């Protein structure tokens, strides 16, 4: 059966996903409660905790950014492992600050939580690392859309997007981070190893996939990344520099000239092709190599 | 400049598609429609395998993802998360996001394949006599209509036949009593048939 993240069964799930250690499946609610299940084994309760937005590391990061009201909402979930695995949550903190009337400012950060229980190591459910995103994420009020570990296992990719509110519009940012394994806990580095800007609002990233390099075998390269835009332009880029290497225009809808924009893309090994879903429900197979 | 080849397209549904997921073991594309249904399409001939609704609440935003490291499929709605895997070459996606019931009298969805249903019907009509049990007539009629609807699609495509499952909407205690009676009746006769497992 499908178990609810909480025993009440009334909270709605905000985000989910898997990272470099996908044996555990995470589910976070909008109120700040995360349940992790051991889906690799029999379906059981593996961890269950609630995120407090008033953590001392979060408080000092918000102090360094600028009663006191903080609302934290998770927008992406990932689990990073090389050394027990840890949960990486992409959170957004909204807080009232004086204008230099109070203004609600949003800041995206990354929170690291312990997963494996004790058999001064940190207890599960507590913060491990509070990574602060650079200034352009806070200036444009961006939110963490997607978190994906790279195929090498040493680098991580974060794709952002413009957070809607309940100028030059940007399509998001691609932040490539370097994994840190100096200590016994999986952590991240404060300095991003790559920053890529999407100056085109039309090129907002909606879905991404990674291509193994051995398909091309029929600074080391980090494979290829296939992304779908809002307008349906499939972009295949090298992960080393995020340069547009291959461009696929969206197809036209039948019976008209409307853009049948691609929304999501996957890789089909049997057809050996990029299978992408259109706006009208069609499926298109793109072949690589010739 | 990299070269990308286009060799056509296919039509899956007229309701639109939002998210995609591919299962590498069965070569099956799990297309997610905008109405919540999951359309399972074969990746070897262009013929669609099955359609599913996950037995979830109507209007929910179904999001499907695949993991090849653990070989598991995750379905996330606004309420709960379900995990599925391969079983005898098909995915049992009818009750993927079934909410666990709290009482014995709650109606539960029971999805079964074709060979198992045929063995159950053969045992119930030839070797098992459970006419005295509660809900026996309803289960026999449901099995009969499911098999007579499946057998028309059986002779056309084998993969679509195997992916097609019969969904019984029956109470939990009635089904439990029926299955216990089947187990007891097959155990007292010492007959090793395929309907017992």
């Amino acid at each position: 059966p499908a178990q609810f993240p909480c025993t009440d069964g009334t909270d709605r799930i905000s985000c989910f996903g898997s990272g470099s250690c996908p044996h555990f499946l995470a589910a976070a609610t909008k109120r700040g409660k995360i349940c992790i299940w051991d889906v690799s084994k029999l379906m059981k309760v593996h961890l269950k905790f609630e995120i407090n937005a008033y953590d001392p590391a979060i408080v000092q990061q918000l102090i360094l950014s600028g009663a006191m009201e903080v609302s934290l909402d998770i927008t992406a979930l990932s689990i990073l492992q090389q050394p027990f695995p840890c949960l990486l949550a992409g959170g957004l903190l909204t807080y009232k600050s004086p204008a230099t009337p109070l203004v609600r400012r949003t800041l995206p950060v990354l929170l690291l939580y312990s997963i494996k229980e004790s058999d001064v190591f940190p207890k599960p459910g507590t913060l491990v690392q509070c990574l602060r995103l650079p200034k352009f994420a806070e200036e444009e009020n961006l939110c963490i859309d997607s978190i994906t570990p790279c195929a090498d296992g040493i680098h991580l990719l974060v794709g952002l997007r413009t957070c809607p509110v309940e100028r030059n519009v940007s399509g998001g940012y691609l932040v490539l981070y370097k994994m840190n394994y100096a200590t016994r806990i999986v952590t991240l580095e404060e300095e991003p190893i790559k920053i890529q800007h999407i100056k085109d609002p039309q090129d907002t990233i909606t879905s991404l996939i990674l291509l193994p390099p051995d398909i091309l075998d029929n600074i080391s390269t980090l494979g290829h990344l296939v992304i779908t835009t809002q307008g349906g332009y499939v972009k295949i880029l090298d992960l080393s520099n995020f340069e547009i290497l291959a461009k696929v225009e969206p197809p036209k809808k039948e019976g008209t000239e409307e853009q049948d924009t691609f929304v999501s893309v996957i890789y089909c090994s049997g057809t050996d092709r990029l299978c992408a879903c259109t706006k009208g429900g069609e499926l298109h197979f793109l072949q690589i190599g010739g | 400049e990299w070269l990308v080849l286009r060799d056509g397209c296919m039509h899956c549904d007229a309701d639109g598609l939002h998210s995609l997921s591919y299962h590498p073991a069965l070569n099956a594309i799990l297309a997610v429609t905008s109405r919540g249904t999951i359309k399972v399409i074969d990746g070897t001939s262009g013929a669609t395998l099955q359609a599913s609704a996950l037995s979830a609440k109507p209007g929910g935003q179904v999001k499907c993802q695949y993991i090849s490291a653990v070989d598991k499929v995750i379905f996330v709605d606004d309420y709960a998360v379900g995990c599925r895997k391969d079983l005898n070459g098909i995915l049992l996606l009818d009750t993927a996001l079934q909410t666990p019931v709290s009482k014995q009298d709650d109606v539960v969805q029971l999805e079964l394949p074709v060979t198992e249903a045929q063995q159950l019907l053969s045992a119930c009509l030839e070797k098992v006599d459970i006419s005295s049990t509660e809900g026996y007539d309803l289960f026999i009629t449901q099995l009969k209509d499911g098999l007579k609807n499946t057998s028309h699609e059986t002779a056309a495509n084998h993969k679509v036949a195997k992916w097609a499952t019969v969904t019984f909407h029956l109470p939990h205690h009635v089904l439990k009593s029926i299955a216990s009676a089947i187990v007891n009746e097959l155990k007292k006769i010492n007959q090793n048939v395929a309907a017992l497992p």
């Binding site: 092709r273 | 056509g8 990746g43």
Partner: peptide, 27 residues
């Protein structure tokens, strides 16, 4: 037999349907 990619003494008729794309046998 080579499995065909999806579109985007006499042998048995199923093998005759894919006789051109054969890759082993008959044995």
């Amino acid at each position: 037999l080579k499995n065909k990619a999806p579109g985007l003494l006499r042998l048995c008729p199923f093998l005759e349907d894919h006789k051109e794309d054969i890759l082993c046998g008959p044995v």
